[PDB]
Amino acid sequence: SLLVDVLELLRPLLPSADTELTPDTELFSSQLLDSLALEEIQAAIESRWVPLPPEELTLANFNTPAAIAETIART
Amino acid sequence: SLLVDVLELLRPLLPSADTELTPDTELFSSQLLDSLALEEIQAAIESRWVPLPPEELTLANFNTPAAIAETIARTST
Amino acid sequence: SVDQTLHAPHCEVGCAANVARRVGVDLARQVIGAHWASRMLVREVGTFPQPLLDRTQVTFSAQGEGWPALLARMTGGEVTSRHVPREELLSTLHADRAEGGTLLFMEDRACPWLDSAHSPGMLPHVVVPDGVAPDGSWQLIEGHSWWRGRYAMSEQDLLAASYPDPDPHHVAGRVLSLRIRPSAERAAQLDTLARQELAAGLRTYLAAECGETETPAGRIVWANGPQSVPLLVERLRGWDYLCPLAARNDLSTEHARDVALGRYLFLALTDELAFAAYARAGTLRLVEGLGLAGAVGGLRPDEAWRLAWRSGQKLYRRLDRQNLSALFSALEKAAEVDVEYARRLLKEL
Amino acid sequence: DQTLHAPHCEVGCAANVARRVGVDLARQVIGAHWASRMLVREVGTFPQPLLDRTQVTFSAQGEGWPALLARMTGGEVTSRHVPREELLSTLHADRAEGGTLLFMEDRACPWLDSAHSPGMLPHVVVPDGVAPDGSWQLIEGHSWWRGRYAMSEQDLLAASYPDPDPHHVAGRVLSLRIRPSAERAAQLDTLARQELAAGLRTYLAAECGETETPAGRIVWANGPQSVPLLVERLRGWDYLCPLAARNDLSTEHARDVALGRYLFLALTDELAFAAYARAGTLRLVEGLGLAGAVGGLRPDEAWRLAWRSGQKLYRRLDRQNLSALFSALEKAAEVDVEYARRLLKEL
Known part of the structure; x- marks a missing residue:
């Protein structure tokens, strides 16, 4: 659901369409995704769900598809 | 011989071996050479002739092989 | 599971918010x-x-x-910078805890969670000593929103982090002591x-x-x-x-x-x-x-x-x-x- | 005859102004x-x-x-942001008692070849009077660029009042009123x-x-x-x-x-x-x-x-x-x- 969406929006930001986008993939602690990617995720959420204030931008809330999907739902 | 020495020292610093080097070739105002080449010229002069203080590092003194040779000649006696 | 440490966009403010909460002060609402x-x-x-x-x-x-300035005057306490000598650092952290706490400065390269081993960064980092971790090391609070949470460091590593060599940022024994517990009145x-x-x-x-x-x-x-x-x-x-x-x-x-x-x-x-x-x-x-x-x-x-x-x-x-x-x-x-x-x-x- | 210069442009500029009033800045002040x-x-x-x-x-x-030039000469070295319609009269008035350091962006100075950037800090030059052509003469005091440069009244005023103005150069002059008494x-x-x-x-x-x-x-x-x-x-x-x-x-x-x-x-x-x-x-x-x-x-x-x-x-x-x-x-x-x-x- 949110996860499917999340897993979709991440696809184009992934470094190669050959990268295992599992829900528990580590996106930032691993240097797979960078700030340019984080920007895209923030803009998606601002446009499709509830815009996030600085206090929700935590490595905890964004290091996995699952965590992001969870951040949006809580939000 | 001083102008000849300057031209020989400069040939290795040029972008390609196909870059033409005359006595009047503009070296720095053209952006042909940069500060990394300038360092090599300063060190050569420091090593072979009279070390140059800041007041001698002028575009006027460094912008052509002829100007460099005249700088070395003026500052050595 | 659900994190419970306070944080802010300026790490020193997030650190200060954790220390304020220990003494019954809501930093973000009552001070900022x-x-x-x-x-x-x-x-x-x-x-x-x-x-x-x-x-x-x-x-x-x-x-x-x-x-x-505001926290000091509102609580009737003090928010004091010092460069503590190494032999006084641990006693200072224990004495500050009774009346609030301490912002302890260190290089980015001392904090493994920052993944910055190859640079001390533009400015020093800051953490809040937070009692003893479950394994007996020092517990540290991270107050920046991105990294927010608690970390652990051995006493030996904590002293090395407070007294680095070389010391580009001058973190040597650098503390901000928050003696901020208000009287009942x-x-x-x-x-x-x-x-x-x-x-x-x-x-x-x-x-x-x-x-x-x-x-x-x-x-x-x-x-x-x-x-x-x-x-x-x-x-x-x-x-x-x-x-x-x-x-x-x-x-x-x-x-x-x-x-x-x-x-x-x-x-x-x-x-x-x-x-x-x-x-x-x-x-x-x-x-x-x-x-x-x-x-x-x-x-x-x-x-x-x-x-x-x-x-x-x-x-x-x-x-x-x-x-x-x-x-x-x-x-x-x-x-x-x-x-x-x-x-x-x-x-x- | 030649222009004085130093590793700091403002120092090379001050040295040219000092020489006009019989002061050797490098020797007697620096x-x-x-x-x-x-x-x-x-x-x-x-x-x-x-x-x-x-x-x-x-x-x-x-x-x-x-500091030293002011107290040694009994004069003043004063910063002013002057309005556009006072600038040229200020440059003439300062020249009588020494001179002026006039600030401009790097991109206003064609010899610097810096059209794409105003650079980290503003540049400075010394106005050295107006020529027959009516052009102003500008002394460059940094060793690398040392020399004298010509600029139209129109370009000088445009240089002194840039838009936008990241460095706040707008009419920024340092007036050197530094002519000592003979004694x-x-x-x-x-x-x-x-x-x-x-x-x-x-x-x-x-x-x-x-x-x-x-x-x-x-x-x-x-x-x-x-x-x-x-x-x-x-x-x-x-x-x-x-x-x-x-x-x-x-x-x-x-x-x-x-x-x-x-x-x-x-x-x-x-x-x-x-x-x-x-x-x-x-x-x-x-x-x-x-x-x-x-x-x-x-x-x-x-x-x-x-x-x-x-x-x-x-x-x-x-x-x-x-x-x-x-x-x-x-x-x-x-x-x-x-x-x-x-x-x-x-x-």
Whole structure:
């Protein structure tokens, strides 16, 4: 659901369409995704769900598809 | 011989071996050479002739092989 | 599972918030939220010589006098910087805990969670010692929103982190001691004092004082109040050269420097816009708790600053003309919402 | 005939104006002010919104030429932002009593070939009167660009009132109203000797201190330990060497190298200034009849060598070039204190 969406929006930001986008993939602690990617995720959420204030931008809330999907739902 | 020495020292610093080097070739105002080449010229002069203080590092003194040779000649006696 | 440590866009503020909560003080609502501020700051050419003036620089602050001043005066305590000798560091941390706590400075490279082994960073990092970790090492609080949480460090590693060699940032025994526990009488007065601080800061804001000081780092120019953000935008138009310059492939070391420094000016500004959103959200929580939210109507300065923050992030991440113009529009909107909110609120105090 | 120049453009500009009123700035003003100071900007009392990074530099300027030139000549060295319709009349009025340093962006100065950037700081030039063509003559005081340049009245006014204006150059003049009386002129070397003694006393006094500002805690140290303290502090940037020796870098790692390189570039300009100032002191000491006090000792040469070691390091950031700068600085510090003690004994 949110996860499917999340897993979709991440696809184009992934470094190669050959990268295992599992829900528990580590996106930032691993240097797979960078700030340019984080920007895209923030803009998606601002446009499709509830815009996030600085206090929700935590490595905890964004290091996995699952965590992001969870951040949006809580939000 | 001083102008000849300057031209020989400069040939290795040029972008390609196909870059033409005359006595009047503009070296720095053209952006042909940069500060990394300038360092090599300063060190050569420091090593072979009279070390140059800041007041001698002028575009006027460094912008052509002829100007460099005249700088070395003026500052050595 | 669900994290419980406080955090903020400036790591020292998030650290301070954790220490304030230990002694019954809500930093974001009663101290940051009680201090309404807006200031443009510039470092520029002044009286020669100024050897530390490396570049013309412009930024913004919503911190005003700052939490060290407000927290100290509101609690009747002290927020004191020292460089402690190594043999006194651990005793200082234990003695500070009884009355609040300590901000302990260290290099980015000392904090494994930052993944910065190859650089001490532009400025030192800060953590809060937080008792003994479950394995018997020292527990540390991280106050920056991105990294927020608790970490552990051995005593040996903690002392090495406080006394690095070399020490570019001068972190050597650097602590900020928060001896801030209010008396029972002072505790009962905190919301009364926070209401007085709120009015005092709104009066300073509307007074719109300006100042300038000649230092060896440059002429430092500042402007408070409603025209602070409009003045900031007028000054930032001067960095419109970054956009075409960042877009080129043939960049001299010099031009690459200009772009790196210009991108950093907007990165630093963006963190100040994040702090503004945080501080304005704190003000809205204070006002709500004081029963005054009727007097401000539904104005949302916190949302206008959040939008300005997002515009800043877009711009430093991609320096193009569309992104620069969007930031300026977001800041002009935040200025308008601020002055209307401030005038409406001060009428009710 | 030729234009005077220095490692700091504003100093080269002031030297041209001083020469118009019979003052040798390098010898009688810069050379009369013996100085050595480590300066640091670091974390202090929160909040400090203009503290972007820890910064370390060196100065041999001490009080600076504006202070010494004003009191030595009985004149004034005054900054003003003047309105556009007063600018040309101000330049003419200043010329009668000395001259003006006029600020402009790098991009207004065609010889700098900087059309795409106003640069990190504003540039400065000295208006040198109007020519028959009605064009204004501009003196460039930086050694690299040294020379005289022509600019139309229209281009000069456009240069002085740029839009946008990141550096705040709008009508920014430094007025040098510095023509000494004939009697004060006749005593200039006596005043130079009194200034020389005063700066040497300050140097040996070795005062140090710190001040909190919105741009950070500013830490300074004067005197014989200024350079040893500088070298100890600069060892903290040794992380730049392994970082600069890598073909891959994040935006943050690239910023760290770019800003670290800028720290050593700025420091290298101060070392060039130190070589310039100490050469000035050598000329002053020789004219005063005091070369006999310091035979052998060449602090001008020791700082020229430190300057060259700096240039090598900022051009190529590696461990060897870093060690070489540290050795060159420690040697200048040694020659400076030996020279200063011998010289002050004779004043």
